[PDB]
Symmetry: D2
Subunit: 115 residues, 4 copies
């Protein structure tokens, strides 16, 4: 599992469950091509998005559908979604964990990159 | 000033100065059209991006060029940029302060919306 | 104004108004001595806590009464308060802005230190 | 495991390893009594601090020794430590995960409370 996404809800103090997550890879024509997607689990995690073979060096975007999550909770949000854009680089073995902490008018994102 | 952007550096405990900021508005054809741009001042603030007349209802994207900021400080950061996407002025004109707190592998963004 | 405290509410996208703030200074006997206190204004800021003459070198604690703030809004939050503990003025006088971003189950704090 | 602490480093994009963590419980005389302590593991986690039997309702403080962590990395920090103060309440079965994201001049803390 070279890429995992974890989403937390700061209003409820819980994992953010059933959040839609879309991953894109930047194409040669500078457009964003769909790469992988899913919904977070009961633990707020989304595993199995890609494989070591497919997840080559490139620029990737992880779009987390925060607005739909807050609307389902009846809470008025600011953002349309939380976007995390980064370059994946082959400086030895790597695993990426993209974490997002959500509030209606704020979000924090952190990336844990390990060997 | 209906739109202001403020950027802070969590490594140095200071305003993030000379950070490039690009604002886009979603067009009828679903593409991102350039709307305004600028660089943060010595206080880490960017004022004067738009006016009450030009800043109509719409979906806006504020792209903060965090990677160039960290690279100039000798840090190879995780993110390409910090992106803030939101619907503006949908219940009438509002004043928006988009704040971003930067670290090499994390960022937080908050919006203060006033009537 | 060598010490200012700014508090924001991430649920409402607004300044956190009327939040109680207590400042303490560590005494020679290692206890926390009351130093200054106040309530945030309509802008979520608390100015005038101290002066350049009184704000000598030392270890200071800024306690922000987040629980009372959330309870007044009808939310039962996780934290009793947000605590910021730091050494001040150890390389000469500095100006400190302590900012706190609040959510029911999370908080972020940042300090901007200027010479 | 009713209480777990997780600490992340936003400068390095990694778990914060070997960070000292001290837990205290508020006594009847209003002082903080030592309750449990440890150091975070290679995953930045600290497990086994307490048991279901010992972790009764009360006010607890988790002190994370951030200054010593940054000093070991040669980075000048703002805070003496990160403090998380909360009430533990018996509203059905519960587990607490206290997470802290560290930067030299900022920290974010989140609590995940699950059944």
């Amino acid at each position: 599992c070279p890429l995992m996404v974890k989403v937390l809800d700061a209003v409820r103090g819980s994992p953010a469950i059933n959040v839609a997550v879309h991953v894109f890879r930047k194409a040669a024509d500078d457009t964003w091509e769909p790469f992988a997607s899913g919904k977070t689990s009961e633990s707020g995690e989304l595993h199995g998005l890609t494989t070591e073979e497919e997840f080559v060096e490139g620029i990737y975007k992880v779009e987390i559908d925060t607005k739909s999550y807050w609307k389902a909770l009846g809470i008025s949000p600011f953002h349309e979604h939380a976007e995390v854009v980064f370059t994946a680089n082959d400086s030895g073995p790597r695993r990426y964990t993209i974490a997002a902490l959500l509030s209606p008018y704020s979000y924090s994102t952190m990336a844990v990159v390990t060997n």
